[PDB]
PDB file of C-alpha atoms and ligand atoms in Angstrom:
ATOM      1  CA  UNK A  44      -0.321   0.663   0.031  1.00  0.00           C
ATOM      2  CA  UNK A  45       0.928   3.809  -0.887  1.00  0.00           C
ATOM      3  CA  UNK A  46       0.318   6.781   1.960  1.00  0.00           C
ATOM      4  CA  UNK A  47       0.679  10.300   2.249  1.00  0.00           C
ATOM      5  CA  UNK A  48      -0.006  13.608   2.655  1.00  0.00           C
ATOM      6  CA  UNK A  49      -1.721  16.312   0.640  1.00  0.00           C
ATOM      7  CA  UNK A  50      -2.510  20.138   0.310  1.00  0.00           C
ATOM      8  CA  UNK A  51      -5.612  20.786  -1.532  1.00  0.00           C
ATOM      9  CA  UNK A  52      -6.292  24.137  -2.550  1.00  0.00           C
ATOM     10  CA  UNK A  53      -9.702  25.111  -4.201  1.00  0.00           C
ATOM     11  CA  UNK A  54     -10.142  28.498  -6.437  1.00  0.00           C
ATOM     12  CA  UNK A  55     -13.307  29.354  -7.535  1.00  0.00           C
ATOM     13  CA  UNK A  56     -13.358  32.331  -9.644  1.00  0.00           C
ATOM     14  CA  UNK A  57     -15.893  34.312  -7.922  1.00  0.00           C
ATOM     15  CA  UNK A  58     -14.998  34.185  -4.239  1.00  0.00           C
ATOM     16  CA  UNK A  59     -12.271  36.696  -2.901  1.00  0.00           C
ATOM     17  CA  UNK A  60      -9.851  34.387  -1.365  1.00  0.00           C
ATOM     18  CA  UNK A  61      -8.749  30.181  -1.465  1.00  0.00           C
ATOM     19  CA  UNK A  62     -10.091  27.648  -0.302  1.00  0.00           C
ATOM     20  CA  UNK A  63      -7.223  26.090   1.992  1.00  0.00           C
ATOM     21  CA  UNK A  64      -7.527  22.152   3.333  1.00  0.00           C
ATOM     22  CA  UNK A  65      -4.984  19.115   4.143  1.00  0.00           C
ATOM     23  CA  UNK A  66      -5.106  15.653   5.769  1.00  0.00           C
ATOM     24  CA  UNK A  67      -3.684  12.390   4.631  1.00  0.00           C
ATOM     25  CA  UNK A  68      -4.146   9.767   1.932  1.00  0.00           C
ATOM     26  CA  UNK A  69      -3.938   5.770   1.947  1.00  0.00           C
ATOM     27  CA  UNK A  70      -4.237   3.803  -1.148  1.00  0.00           C
ATOM     28  CA  UNK A  71      -4.167  -0.239  -1.419  1.00  0.00           C
ATOM     29  CA  UNK A  72      -3.597  -2.499  -4.172  1.00  0.00           C
ATOM     30  CA  UNK A  73      -6.894  -3.669  -3.997  1.00  0.00           C
ATOM     31  CA  UNK A  74      -8.387  -0.589  -5.570  1.00  0.00           C
ATOM     32  CA  UNK A  75      -9.124   1.061  -1.933  1.00  0.00           C
ATOM     33  CA  UNK A  76      -8.803   4.690  -1.509  1.00  0.00           C
ATOM     34  CA  UNK A  77      -8.908   6.634   1.764  1.00  0.00           C
ATOM     35  CA  UNK A  78      -8.927  10.170   1.507  1.00  0.00           C
ATOM     36  CA  UNK A  79      -8.527  11.653   4.678  1.00  0.00           C
ATOM     37  CA  UNK A  80      -8.831  15.558   5.228  1.00  0.00           C
ATOM     38  CA  UNK A  81      -7.636  16.942   8.672  1.00  0.00           C
ATOM     39  CA  UNK A  82      -8.075  20.785   8.255  1.00  0.00           C
ATOM     40  CA  UNK A  83      -9.570  22.694   8.823  1.00  0.00           C
ATOM     41  CA  UNK A  84     -12.981  20.326   9.339  1.00  0.00           C
ATOM     42  CA  UNK A  85     -12.450  16.714   9.560  1.00  0.00           C
ATOM     43  CA  UNK A  86     -13.703  15.332   6.289  1.00  0.00           C
ATOM     44  CA  UNK A  87     -13.440  11.333   5.434  1.00  0.00           C
ATOM     45  CA  UNK A  88     -13.921   9.905   1.525  1.00  0.00           C
ATOM     46  CA  UNK A  89     -13.399   6.429   1.151  1.00  0.00           C
ATOM     47  CA  UNK A  90     -13.468   4.512  -2.096  1.00  0.00           C
ATOM     48  CA  UNK A  91     -14.052   0.819  -2.822  1.00  0.00           C
ATOM     49  CA  UNK A  92     -14.401  -0.965  -6.378  1.00  0.00           C
ATOM     50  CA  UNK A  93     -18.302  -0.737  -5.949  1.00  0.00           C
ATOM     51  CA  UNK A  94     -18.998   2.743  -3.777  1.00  0.00           C
ATOM     52  CA  UNK A  95     -18.157   6.103  -3.248  1.00  0.00           C
ATOM     53  CA  UNK A  96     -18.306   7.160   0.302  1.00  0.00           C
ATOM     54  CA  UNK A  97     -18.353  11.010   2.208  1.00  0.00           C
ATOM     55  CA  UNK A  98     -18.232  11.088   5.783  1.00  0.00           C
ATOM     56  CA  UNK A  99     -17.827  15.492   7.120  1.00  0.00           C
ATOM     57  CA  UNK A 100     -17.223  15.317  11.042  1.00  0.00           C
ATOM     58  CA  UNK A 101     -18.960  12.908  12.575  1.00  0.00           C
ATOM     59  CA  UNK A 102     -22.171  12.923  10.704  1.00  0.00           C
ATOM     60  CA  UNK A 103     -23.426   9.471   8.865  1.00  0.00           C
ATOM     61  CA  UNK A 104     -21.531   8.554   5.558  1.00  0.00           C
ATOM     62  CA  UNK A 105     -23.570   9.542   2.571  1.00  0.00           C
ATOM     63  CA  UNK A 106     -22.758   7.622  -1.028  1.00  0.00           C
ATOM     64  CA  UNK A 107     -21.948   9.194  -3.427  1.00  0.00           C
ATOM     65  CA  UNK A 108     -23.166   9.141  -7.079  1.00  0.00           C
ATOM     66  CA  UNK A 109     -21.676   9.502 -10.263  1.00  0.00           C
ATOM     67  CA  UNK A 110     -24.035  11.765 -11.724  1.00  0.00           C
ATOM     68  CA  UNK A 111     -24.326  14.395  -8.916  1.00  0.00           C
ATOM     69  CA  UNK A 112     -20.864  14.296  -8.028  1.00  0.00           C
ATOM     70  CA  UNK A 113     -18.936  13.830 -11.108  1.00  0.00           C
ATOM     71  CA  UNK A 114     -15.479  15.611 -10.341  1.00  0.00           C
ATOM     72  CA  UNK A 115     -15.398  13.683  -7.417  1.00  0.00           C
ATOM     73  CA  UNK A 116     -15.768  10.445  -9.029  1.00  0.00           C
ATOM     74  CA  UNK A 117     -13.386  11.251 -11.552  1.00  0.00           C
ATOM     75  CA  UNK A 118     -10.669  12.718  -9.349  1.00  0.00           C
ATOM     76  CA  UNK A 119     -10.471   9.490  -7.552  1.00  0.00           C
ATOM     77  CA  UNK A 120     -10.936   7.265 -10.293  1.00  0.00           C
ATOM     78  CA  UNK A 121      -7.992   8.909 -12.083  1.00  0.00           C
ATOM     79  CA  UNK A 122      -5.731   9.434  -8.910  1.00  0.00           C
ATOM     80  CA  UNK A 123      -6.194   5.517  -8.578  1.00  0.00           C
ATOM     81  CA  UNK A 124      -5.352   4.786 -11.702  1.00  0.00           C
ATOM     82  CA  UNK A 125      -2.314   6.577 -12.089  1.00  0.00           C
ATOM     83  CA  UNK A 126      -1.428   4.580  -8.764  1.00  0.00           C
ATOM     84  CA  UNK A 127      -2.018   1.702 -10.614  1.00  0.00           C
ATOM     85  CA  UNK A 128      -0.317   2.336 -13.993  1.00  0.00           C
ATOM     86  CA  UNK A 129      -3.673   1.715 -15.298  1.00  0.00           C
ATOM     87  CA  UNK A 130      -4.012   4.025 -18.169  1.00  0.00           C
ATOM     88  CA  UNK A 131      -6.315   1.823 -20.469  1.00  0.00           C
ATOM     89  CA  UNK A 132      -8.796   3.009 -18.168  1.00  0.00           C
ATOM     90  CA  UNK A 133      -7.816   6.469 -18.103  1.00  0.00           C
ATOM     91  CA  UNK A 134      -8.148   6.363 -21.988  1.00  0.00           C
ATOM     92  CA  UNK A 135     -11.704   5.271 -21.968  1.00  0.00           C
ATOM     93  CA  UNK A 136     -12.354   8.356 -21.146  1.00  0.00           C
ATOM     94  CA  UNK A 137      -9.601  11.302 -21.543  1.00  0.00           C
ATOM     95  CA  UNK A 138      -7.590  11.814 -24.108  1.00  0.00           C
ATOM     96  CA  UNK A 139      -3.534  11.855 -22.764  1.00  0.00           C
ATOM     97  CA  UNK A 140      -0.410  13.367 -23.117  1.00  0.00           C
ATOM     98  CA  UNK A 141       2.878  12.619 -21.547  1.00  0.00           C
ATOM     99  CA  UNK A 142       5.587  14.526 -21.414  1.00  0.00           C
ATOM    100  CA  UNK A 143       8.833  13.263 -19.646  1.00  0.00           C
ATOM    101  CA  UNK A 144      10.744  10.713 -18.247  1.00  0.00           C
ATOM    102  CA  UNK A 145      10.665   8.532 -14.792  1.00  0.00           C
ATOM    103  CA  UNK A 146      11.976  11.197 -12.873  1.00  0.00           C
ATOM    104  CA  UNK A 147       9.981  13.900 -13.835  1.00  0.00           C
ATOM    105  CA  UNK A 148       7.339  13.512 -15.927  1.00  0.00           C
ATOM    106  CA  UNK A 149       3.501  15.188 -16.721  1.00  0.00           C
ATOM    107  CA  UNK A 150       0.123  13.477 -17.802  1.00  0.00           C
ATOM    108  CA  UNK A 151      -2.727  15.947 -19.659  1.00  0.00           C
ATOM    109  CA  UNK A 152      -5.919  14.799 -19.618  1.00  0.00           C
ATOM    110  CA  UNK A 153      -9.103  16.379 -21.816  1.00  0.00           C
ATOM    111  CA  UNK A 154     -12.326  14.384 -21.588  1.00  0.00           C
ATOM    112  CA  UNK A 155     -12.648  13.119 -24.868  1.00  0.00           C
ATOM    113  CA  UNK A 156     -16.775  13.776 -25.023  1.00  0.00           C
ATOM    114  CA  UNK A 157     -19.647  14.652 -23.033  1.00  0.00           C
ATOM    115  CA  UNK A 158     -21.140  14.404 -20.363  1.00  0.00           C
ATOM    116  CA  UNK A 159     -17.771  14.354 -18.511  1.00  0.00           C
ATOM    117  CA  UNK A 160     -16.405  17.848 -21.137  1.00  0.00           C
ATOM    118  CA  UNK A 161     -19.387  19.813 -19.441  1.00  0.00           C
ATOM    119  CA  UNK A 162     -17.542  19.552 -15.974  1.00  0.00           C
ATOM    120  CA  UNK A 163     -13.937  18.819 -16.526  1.00  0.00           C
ATOM    121  CA  UNK A 164     -11.453  21.170 -18.946  1.00  0.00           C
ATOM    122  CA  UNK A 165      -8.500  18.920 -18.199  1.00  0.00           C
ATOM    123  CA  UNK A 166      -6.888  17.474 -15.497  1.00  0.00           C
ATOM    124  CA  UNK A 167      -3.412  18.026 -15.422  1.00  0.00           C
ATOM    125  CA  UNK A 168      -1.091  15.683 -12.885  1.00  0.00           C
ATOM    126  CA  UNK A 169       3.340  15.459 -12.627  1.00  0.00           C
ATOM    127  CA  UNK A 170       5.223  13.479 -10.402  1.00  0.00           C
ATOM    128  CA  UNK A 171       8.562  11.058 -10.345  1.00  0.00           C
ATOM    129  CA  UNK A 172       8.347   7.740  -8.735  1.00  0.00           C
ATOM    130  CA  UNK A 173       5.037   8.606  -7.523  1.00  0.00           C
ATOM    131  CA  UNK A 174       2.077  11.797  -8.580  1.00  0.00           C
ATOM    132  CA  UNK A 175       2.899  14.898  -6.649  1.00  0.00           C
ATOM    133  CA  UNK A 176       0.730  17.036  -8.255  1.00  0.00           C
ATOM    134  CA  UNK A 177      -2.978  17.009  -9.404  1.00  0.00           C
ATOM    135  CA  UNK A 178      -4.748  19.868 -10.879  1.00  0.00           C
ATOM    136  CA  UNK A 179      -8.496  19.908 -11.627  1.00  0.00           C
ATOM    137  CA  UNK A 180      -9.932  22.913 -13.431  1.00  0.00           C
ATOM    138  CA  UNK A 181     -13.571  22.495 -14.338  1.00  0.00           C
ATOM    139  CA  UNK A 182     -15.417  24.589 -17.462  1.00  0.00           C
ATOM    140  CA  UNK A 183     -16.295  27.363 -14.800  1.00  0.00           C
ATOM    141  CA  UNK A 184     -12.790  28.827 -14.593  1.00  0.00           C
ATOM    142  CA  UNK A 185     -12.456  26.881 -11.008  1.00  0.00           C
ATOM    143  CA  UNK A 186      -9.446  25.325 -10.346  1.00  0.00           C
ATOM    144  CA  UNK A 187      -8.385  22.904  -7.856  1.00  0.00           C
ATOM    145  CA  UNK A 188      -4.842  22.034  -7.438  1.00  0.00           C
ATOM    146  CA  UNK A 189      -3.464  19.411  -4.661  1.00  0.00           C
ATOM    147  CA  UNK A 190       0.305  18.609  -4.181  1.00  0.00           C
ATOM    148  CA  UNK A 191       0.942  15.113  -2.294  1.00  0.00           C
ATOM    149  CA  UNK A 192       3.854  14.486  -0.181  1.00  0.00           C
ATOM    150  CA  UNK A 193       5.346  12.458   2.205  1.00  0.00           C
ATOM    151  CA  UNK A 194       4.627   9.683   0.439  1.00  0.00           C
ATOM    152  CA  UNK A 195       5.481   6.385   0.823  1.00  0.00           C
ATOM    153  CA  UNK A 196       4.644   2.107   0.147  1.00  0.00           C
ATOM    154  CA  UNK A 197       4.364  -0.051   3.196  1.00  0.00           C
TER     155      UNK A 197
HETATM  156 CL1   CL B 201      -3.121  -1.216 -25.502  1.00  0.00          CL
HETATM  157 CL1   CL B 202      13.372  13.753 -20.933  1.00  0.00          CL
END
């Protein structure tokens, strides 16, 4: 399995500040992702084969739907897929451009068709042995930038 820390900055074009959050993540080879936001409010996202849930503080988790939360479903799918080397699944829904080498690469993803291309403009991933940066731009001039660090394999 693979685990590390994240810092997340959300820039919505109409807001007068950026929204910052941070926490940890844990991936296992059996396709589970645990995304634990620790600041500024505790929240947890859990992905497994057939399910994505989100938990806010100590409230009951809710099951997310791809039709209501397309960007979260897309982000977690792409995140998992790149850690696993599963470019086949990515290429079903995205155009892929790879630039660089094993020590420094950038992957640019643009959606191939509707309805994904109504939600996402581009996803940019950068990294080395592991992903270090993920940026998600929606079609409304909003950007979410994530940095991954202190990554270890266990
Ligand atoms: Cl192929
Ligand atoms: Cl090169």
